[PDB]
Amino acid sequence: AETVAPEFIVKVRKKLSLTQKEASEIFGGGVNAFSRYEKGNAQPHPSTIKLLRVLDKHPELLNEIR
Amino acid sequence: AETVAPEFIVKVRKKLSLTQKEASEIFGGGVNAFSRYEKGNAQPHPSTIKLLRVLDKHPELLNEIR
């Protein structure tokens, strides 16, 4: 499974001007998902990692998914 | 949770020239994930749905994630 640095998750979430709660709602994983991901205590779903990588490069795509 | 038609999943997977096995590896969900999704017998992760919607519009983004 592709892995991801917790710091990368924080970076992209903040670039998108999302709260942890909002990110968890949009990307899935349950209410406290991003809180755990950003502490390195859970692994996001592979699709969450890949979607975050896409959004890091093309943040305007948030308007297509939110 | 946003829902998705099984036919949409098939459409995007085939547009991307992926097998069910390849899609399951790239997007996650386990080996038989797409087999189940395309029969309507499991719900993809929210990030999988959103990433498929992005790829339907911008299929070239497969090169950023594969």
Numbering used by the authors:
A (entry chain A), B (entry chain A): 66 to 131
What did the original publication write about this model?
Our biochemical and structural analysis of the E. coli MqsA antitoxin and the MqsR:MqsA-N complex provide a detailed 3-dimensional structural view of the free antitoxin and the TA complex. These structures combined with our biochemical data unequivocally demonstrate that MqsR, a protein previously shown to be critical for biofilm formation and the most highly upregulated gene in persister cells in E. coli, and MqsA form a novel bacterial TA system. Our data show that, as expected for a TA system, the expression of the MqsR toxin leads to growth arrest, while co-expression with its antitoxin, MqsA, rescues the growth arrest phenotype. In addition, MqsR associates with MqsA to form a tight, non-toxic complex and both MqsA alone and the MqsR:MqsA2:MqsR complex bind and regulate the mqsR promoter. MqsA itself is a two-domain protein with a novel fold that, unlike every other antitoxin, is well-ordered throughout its entire sequence and whose structure does not change upon toxin binding.
MqsA-C, the helix-turn-helix (HTH) domain, is composed of five tightly packed α-helices, which bury a central hydrophobic core. This core is composed of eight residues, including Val69, Val77, Leu83, Phe92, Phe99, Tyr102, Pro109, and Leu117. Of these, all but one (Val69) are perfectly conserved among the MqsA family. Structural similarity searches demonstrated that MqsA-C shows significant homology to the bacteriophage 434 Cro repressor, the P22 C2 repressor and HigA antitoxin, placing it in HTH-XRE family of DNA binding proteins. The MqsA C-terminal domain is necessary and sufficient for binding the mqsR promoter (PmqsR), as incubation of PmqsR with MqsA-C results in a shift in the electrophoretic mobility of the DNA. In contrast, no shift is observed when the DNA is incubated with either MqsA-N alone or the MqsR:MqsA-N complex. These results show that DNA binding is mediated exclusively by MqsA-C. MqsA is the first antitoxin that has been shown experimentally to bind DNA via its C-terminal domain. In MqsA, the HTH-XRE DNA binding helix corresponds to α-helix 4 (α-helix 4 highlighted in green). Moreover, MqsA α-helix 4 is the only stretch of residues that is perfectly conserved among all MqsA proteins. Taken together, these data provide strong evidence that MqsA binds DNA via α-helix 4.
